[PDB]
Amino acid sequence: GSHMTPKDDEFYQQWQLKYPKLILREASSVSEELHKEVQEAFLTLHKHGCLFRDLVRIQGKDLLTPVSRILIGNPGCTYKYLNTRLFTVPWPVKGTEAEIAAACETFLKLNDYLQIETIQALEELAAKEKAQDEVDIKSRAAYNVTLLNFMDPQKMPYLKEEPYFGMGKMAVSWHHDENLVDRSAVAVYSYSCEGRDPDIWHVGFKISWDIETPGLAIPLHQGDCYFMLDDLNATHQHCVLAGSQPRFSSTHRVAECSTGTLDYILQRCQLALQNVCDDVDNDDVSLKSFEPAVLKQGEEIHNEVEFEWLRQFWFQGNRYRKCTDWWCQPMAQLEALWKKMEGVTNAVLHEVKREGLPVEQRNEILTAILASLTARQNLRREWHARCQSRIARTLPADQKPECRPYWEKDDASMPLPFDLTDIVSELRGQLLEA
Ligand SMILES: Cc1ccc(Cl)c(Nc2ccccc2C(=O)O)c1Cl
Ligand SMILES: O=C(O)CNC(=O)C(=O)O
Ligand SMILES: [Mn+2]
């Protein structure tokens, strides 16, 4: 098991014959106007301390990313990898701080450019496949976010070795980019500060399943861009090989956000609250229907807003409040919507305890809502635990994994306990009463 770089004669023909959906556009191809603007944006962003290592989960384990990052993109958009939902600090799409919003404006135009370069290469790539479709192409380049990366190999000197082709130290281990639109492209701007050369940053590629076809290590210099086209991200894996100097990168993606925008999730909540009499906002929640399919939907949306949104957000300690206040209000509103749903749940629970309610209808209600209440107990445990791992305590005071929402047994404001174990036990019991 070995690797190839431009030092090798076979490199170029291997690139052409076994990795042709990968494109390099060296630093020369990018206007010098742009290079300075985005390199300042990286630096300003870093200075204001907008880049955090993410507390991520993989194969059951809580791990911090070697790399520090921030997600920038369309307002209300999220990008989710390794069970962690990153929320965009927004960029001036038509429709917070002066210095910070300058960097975001910058990466938006980077986005515009990379998108342009991408559509072109996709057009060329299709043209080489002759020896409507233009909507497919344009959508697969419609980058809606970029995830920025930073590492200092010296200040962060805790790097794994590459296991298969001897490529050396990895800033990022072998992976596929998750949560991307099918066959959508990825475009990376690489900003270094200064066998394969250990001091230089590379991106590495291999075929999935394969450690016999030699991998490519491609040198990345200050300002070089690369592009993963079409199904490349699915058929191959990539990693980042660290150099010795620090480096930034901006990875532009077409996030599959069909259940991952603010608007999507507000609409979901609003769909749940249609089962609620909504003349007035108080604690006396009254439901229009107890048809199983509707109660189930309500409880599923309840879970969705709680775990994919509130807890994901608060798990990162409102670290983005340093960059924008953008999510602050929407997250308050989702909490407020969530609390009403606790009201809904409580009311369903009330109706299940009602005398003059035929067991048949009661058991139909139980069977509809049981899986959701179960999933809700287990995930509440998981998030509680994940919030209090010693790896999470070690973190600073502005990134402290807050377990929100959380309330004590004596809390008069909440109609239901955080711990649903007794509630769940009982409902399960009644369903087995024969
Ligand atoms: C699959 C994937 C996706 C994104 C990152 Cl940053 C990584 N890198 C890590 C993430 C968490 C913990 C360790 C690593 C690593 O690179 O060793 C990986 Cl392995
Ligand atoms: O930084 C790079 O060049 C490659 N980035 C990634 O693979 C990533 O952030 O998912
Ligand atoms: Mn990647």
Author numbering: 28 to 122, 128 to 163, 188 to 250, 264 to 503
Q: Anything the authors wrote about it?
A:
In order to investigate the molecular recognition at atomic resolution, the structure of FTO in complex with the inhibitor MA was determined by crystallography in the presence of metal ion and N-Oxalylglycine (NOG), a chemical mimic of cofactor 2OG. MA was bound in the NTD region, and close to the interface of NTD and CTD. The binding site of MA is partially overlaid by dm3T- and rhein-binding sites. This explains the competitive property of MA binding to FTO over the m6A-containing nucleic acid. The metal ion is ligated by His231, Asp233 and His307, and bidentate NOG exists in an octahedral geometry. The following side chains come into contact with NOG: Asn205, Tyr295 and Arg316 through hydrogen bonding or salt bridge interactions. Hydrogen bonding occurs between the carboxyl group in MA and amides in Ser229 directly and Lys216 through a water molecule, respectively. One chlorine atom in MA directly contacts the complex guanidinium group in Arg96. In addition, the phenyl ring bearing carboxyl acid substituent forms hydrophobic interactions with the side chains of neighboring residues, Ile85, Leu90 and Pro93. Of note, the first loop in the FTO nucleotide recognition lid (NRL), β3i and β4i, which has been defined as the part of the NRL, provides hydrophobic interactions with inhibitor MA.
